[PDB]
Amino acid sequence: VKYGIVLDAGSSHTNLYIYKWPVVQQLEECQVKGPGISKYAQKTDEIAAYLAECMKMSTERIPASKQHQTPVYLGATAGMRLLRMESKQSADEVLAAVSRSLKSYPFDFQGAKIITGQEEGAYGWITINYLLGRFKGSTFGALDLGGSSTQITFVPLNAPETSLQFRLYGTDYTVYTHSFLCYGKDQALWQKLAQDIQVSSGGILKDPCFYPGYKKVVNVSELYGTPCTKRFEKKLPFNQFQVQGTGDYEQCHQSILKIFNHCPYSQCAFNGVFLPPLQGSFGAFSAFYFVMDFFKKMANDSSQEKMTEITKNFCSKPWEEVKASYPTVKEKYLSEYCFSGTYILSLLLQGYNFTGTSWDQIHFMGKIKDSNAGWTLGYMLNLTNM
Amino acid sequence: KYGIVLDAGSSHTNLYIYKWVVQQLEECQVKGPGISKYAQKTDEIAAYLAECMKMSTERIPASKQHQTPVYLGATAGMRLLRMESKQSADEVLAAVSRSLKSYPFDFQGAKIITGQEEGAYGWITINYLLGRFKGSTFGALDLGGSSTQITFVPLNSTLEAPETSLQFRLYGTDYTVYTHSFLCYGKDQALWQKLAQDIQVSSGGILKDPCFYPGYKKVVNVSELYGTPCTKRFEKKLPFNQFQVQGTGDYEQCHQSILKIFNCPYSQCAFNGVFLPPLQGSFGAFSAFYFVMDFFKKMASSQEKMTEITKNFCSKPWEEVKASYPTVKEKYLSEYCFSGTYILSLLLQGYNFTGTSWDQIHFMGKIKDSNAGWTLGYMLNLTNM
Ligand SMILES: [Cl-]
Ligand SMILES: [Cl-]
Ligand SMILES: [Cl-]
Ligand SMILES: [Cl-]
Ligand SMILES: [Cl-]
Ligand SMILES: [Cl-]
Ligand SMILES: [Cl-]
Ligand SMILES: [Cl-]
Ligand SMILES: [Cl-]
Ligand code: NA
Incomplete structure (x- = not known):
């Protein structure tokens, strides 16, 4: 054994x-x-x-x-x-x-x-397709999302800079992979705060992505501490501020759309980046998994209409309630959830264009075998x- | 080989x-x-x-x-x-x-x-040819019919980090190059954008245009004009198949009306909400930058100068112009007032080459x-x- x-x-x-x-x-x-x-x-x-x-x-x-x-x-x-x-x-x-x-x-x-992101997205696509035994045919797309970047990797039917050719068990594969740095769930949150904090803020940021009654204190130098916010940087009259939850899914969506920017192709992800038409099944893992999984488990462990509805409902639960309702979950995750879920929905639907018929072809997984x-x-x- | x-x-x-x-x-x-x-x-x-x-x-x-x-x-x-x-x-x-x-x-x-593979290779192309890899490098401005790229290293290292960025390790140095390609911002597609915008329904079937020389006329088919994605945003129901362009040959106004087909989260942008770092160092402008600017250069240096030359050239009646330059293809010759004015706005307002920055641009056809x-x-x- 090795x-x-x-x-x-x-x-x-x-x-x-x-x-x-063995x-x-x-x-x-x-x-x-x-x-x-x-x-x-x-x-x-x-x-x-x-x-x-x-x-x-x-x-x-x-x-x-x-x-x-x-x-x-x-x-x-x-x-x-x-x-x-x-x-x-x-x-x-x-x-x-x-x-x-x-x-x-x-x-x-x-x-x-x-x-590299191009490697990373490739390998995860390998991991999944290996794991399903899909190398023992046709294959699963790989969707990854962490704190900092998000990847998508899949084979389209027959923009070279973005592709990978790879022969594996006698088959030559052309796989589309791309990595959106600054689009992991945490950097997005930073981007969103930076952008939304106006000078007039008063050190108070009313935010619809967090539960009525949440408070979190945020440090300007940390916030400007990352390259992902360079673009929203302002000279601020306070050294930090406090986020205050208003818990409104609508607005939190609206405001999340703002951190994404026409498209030079047939269709795009976001930010002018090419995206081929969607094809076949996908597995969505890491933060995709853990987040969706938390929401799925309020829907009798379903559809985009129903997930969105679950999130709208959830985002308005006051913070004390949310805590009390899910007492065994780390306070650090639990607080992200309204934001994360809202975020993930948008990233998959507007971002990766998983609208319409496409939504159910995504299967969220932590582990295979x-x-x-x-x-x-x-x-x-x-x-x-x- | x-x-x-x-x-x-x-x-x-x-x-x-x-x-x-x-x-x-x-x-x-x-x-x-x-x-x-x-x-x-x-x-x-x-x-x-x-x-x-x-x-x-x-x-x-x-x-x-x-x-x-x-x-x-x-x-x-x-x-x-x-x-x-x-x-x-x-x-x-x-x-x-x-x-x-x-x-x-x-x-x-x-x-x-891709426009980035395009901006990349062209930037590589000039620096190879200028022996620059041994030192540091030149920026690249390329213009064609349909698109325009700009590609250069800013002092900052990584700053905006938006995927307006590449890596290119090249003979021992990793280069962080900013590159972008503005689809529909080639000289021709920008022409059709401008006609498409400025054509009024009421027009009678005539567009008076100041980017063309007094006495210039050209007939334009509406289904060609709308036949490109680039005027999609401008489409209107028109009560005619075609119309005639009539130069009024006025640079001021040509400039005015060109600006209109341009529209920024960042410290600074190019145009249309697209990021542009600070201009940095020197540049080689080529393809249509070179063939158009070189034409004007031969009617003499500085930017106020190239402006005075274009204002003047835009007033020469079309008969005069064609007589002055009989050896040139009417298809290029007829476009020069417009292209000159275009180029000048692109470089100055788009890319911010204003004032001091201007003289960092060297137009070039071919190296070695x-x-x-x-x-x-x-x-x-x-x-x-
Ligand atoms: Cl990550
Ligand atoms: Cl992060
Ligand atoms: Cl890390
Ligand atoms: Cl509360
Ligand atoms: Cl719990
Ligand atoms: Cl072109
Ligand atoms: Cl063209
Ligand atoms: Cl072609
Ligand atoms: Cl001639
Ligand atoms: Na999209």
């Missing part, structure tokens, strides 16, 4: 996966407590301890004899793309600190790098040549 | 033969308009391409021929055709392919390149007996240099 370890260093979490193979399977997953590694830009010496728990789990989990032969990879995504954008130097320092830390365990260190839908398996695959 | 690239633009298809530093060996302009005009009559494509293709088989030694790659890259003319009919565009591309496939070269594809154009830049890619 083992491999891949760390998915995304902008909200670093997730470590252990794979094994078909390859996920043996275990570990979520590193804390945010993504880019938040370590100053305090890179703390990275070692940050990674310690998930790394110790792996040394306790893989037999000692198999350990020096076991490869270890870190692939970083949009969070780190943004950090690099801000400071090449910082991003490098973070990657090096990660490296020193992983190098020290008794595994075969294989590199820490920022993978007890293995996480993500890109790290795909990355694993190509990397092992298994 | 040799390679061939066809530049299928909206007015002309141009074939380039490169050989190898890489040099243009020869160029051939295919007679007729661009391939999109073949949408119905795709079987005619073969003969249309025949002259320039035979030239190449006569030109490259036979032994070198099977090893020689051949590419066709199509630009905004074909983007517009695809926008009207996916199917048509595909049929055109296929007909082109069957035709090219039949020659004894190494057929490497016929495709519509090689054309400014995307094609050579493509060529260096299509041999992973």
Whole structure:
């Protein structure tokens, strides 16, 4: 039996996966407590301890004899793309600190790098299609959404810059992939606040994307701390402000549409980016999954008309009610949900154009065959040549 | 070694033969308009391409021929055709392919390149040719019938990061290049936008126009005018099949009326809500920037100067003008007042080359007996240099 370890260093979490193979399977997953590694830009010496728990789990989990032969990879995504954008130097320092830390365990260190969006979207499409056994025919589109970027990867029926050719089990595949940096659910929220905060705000932001009675305090330097808001930057007369929920789905939608900008093609995603016509089935995972899943589970674990209605209803539940109603859910997720859901609906319908007949062809999944839908398996695959 | 690239633009298809530093060996302009005009009559494509293709088989030694790659890259003319009919565009591309496939070269594809792939390659093309990769680089302004690109590195590094951005690692340097392509902002499509806008229902079937010389007349068919996606936003029910353009030959007013077919979340934009970073460093403007500005230059430097020259030229009656320049094709000559004024607004208001910035632009036809154009830049890619 063989083992491999891949760390998915995304902008909200670093997730470590252990794979094994006598078909390859996920043996275990570990979520590193804390945010993504880019938040370590100053305090890179703390990275070692940050990674310690998930790394110790792996040394306790893989037999000692198999350990020096076991490869270890870190692939970083949009969070780190943004950090690099801000400071090449910082991003490098973070990657090096990660490296020193992983190098020290008794595994075969294989590199820490920022993978491209074009790679990432590809690999996740591989992971899913592998997992469904759809490589044992015709295939599933891959929709990914994290804190910072969102990807879409699928095969259309017979704009080269954007495509990938790839031969896999005797078949040559042309796969459309694209990554919208700044369009993960969190960066969108930033974009939306930046844009909506006027100078006259008073340090108070009434917002329809959050529940009546929610309050959250937001720091201007953090908010302008990311490249995704450079475009809305103003010099502000206060060093922070407080978001106040008005919980109105209508308006929150309206206001979410504003962070997206005619199209030079047959049809587009948004921002002038080409999108081919929709084709076949899709699996929507990560934030897509977790968010939709929370809403689905108020619809007897349905349609776009019904999902929208569920969200409108939910967004108006006062905050105290929402908390009390879902007491076992982390306050940090629970608060995002009205925004996230509203956001996800728009991204799929106006964004990826999943309107009309197209809506039901999306199947939301966390795991296939007890293995996480993500890109790290795909990355694993190509990397092992298994 | 040799390679061939066809530049299928909206007015002309141009074939380039490169050989190898890489040099243009020869160029051939295919007679007729661009391939999109073949949408119905795709079987005619073969003969249309025949002259320039035979030239190449006569030109490259036979032994070198099977090893020689051949590419066709199509630009905004074909983007517009695809926008009207996916199917048509595909049929055109296929007909082109069957035709090219039949020659004894190494057929490497016929495709519509993106405005960014377009702005990219052209920017690469000039910097290669100016020996710039060794140092730092020049901006690229390209203008054609249907579209206009602008491509340059801003000081900022990443700032706006909107996907108006590329990476291009090139002989050891990773370059963050801003590039955009304004579809329908080529000189011709901008002309038709302007007519389309300014035509009033009441008109009688005559459009008085100040971008044309006193005494200029041209008859324009309404179904051609509305036949492009670019005047879609301007369509109106008109009580006539055609109308006549009549120059009143006034630059002031031409400028006025040109501005109107232009419309910003950002610190700054180009036009129409599209981001543009701060202008930075120097630029080579080419294709129609060069063929039009060079014409005016030859009636002499500075921008107030090129303005005075265009105001004056726009007043010369059409009979005078045609007599003054008898060796020029009436099809180009008749457009110059408009193009000059256009170019001047595009550079100054669009791209903000106002004041001080102006003199950073060097218009250029060709560097080292090689054309400014995307094609050579493509060529260096299509041999992973
Ligand atoms: Cl991160
Ligand atoms: Cl992400
Ligand atoms: Cl994020
Ligand atoms: Cl409350
Ligand atoms: Cl709960
Ligand atoms: Cl054409
Ligand atoms: Cl063009
Ligand atoms: Cl044109
Ligand atoms: Cl002459
Ligand atoms: Na859309």
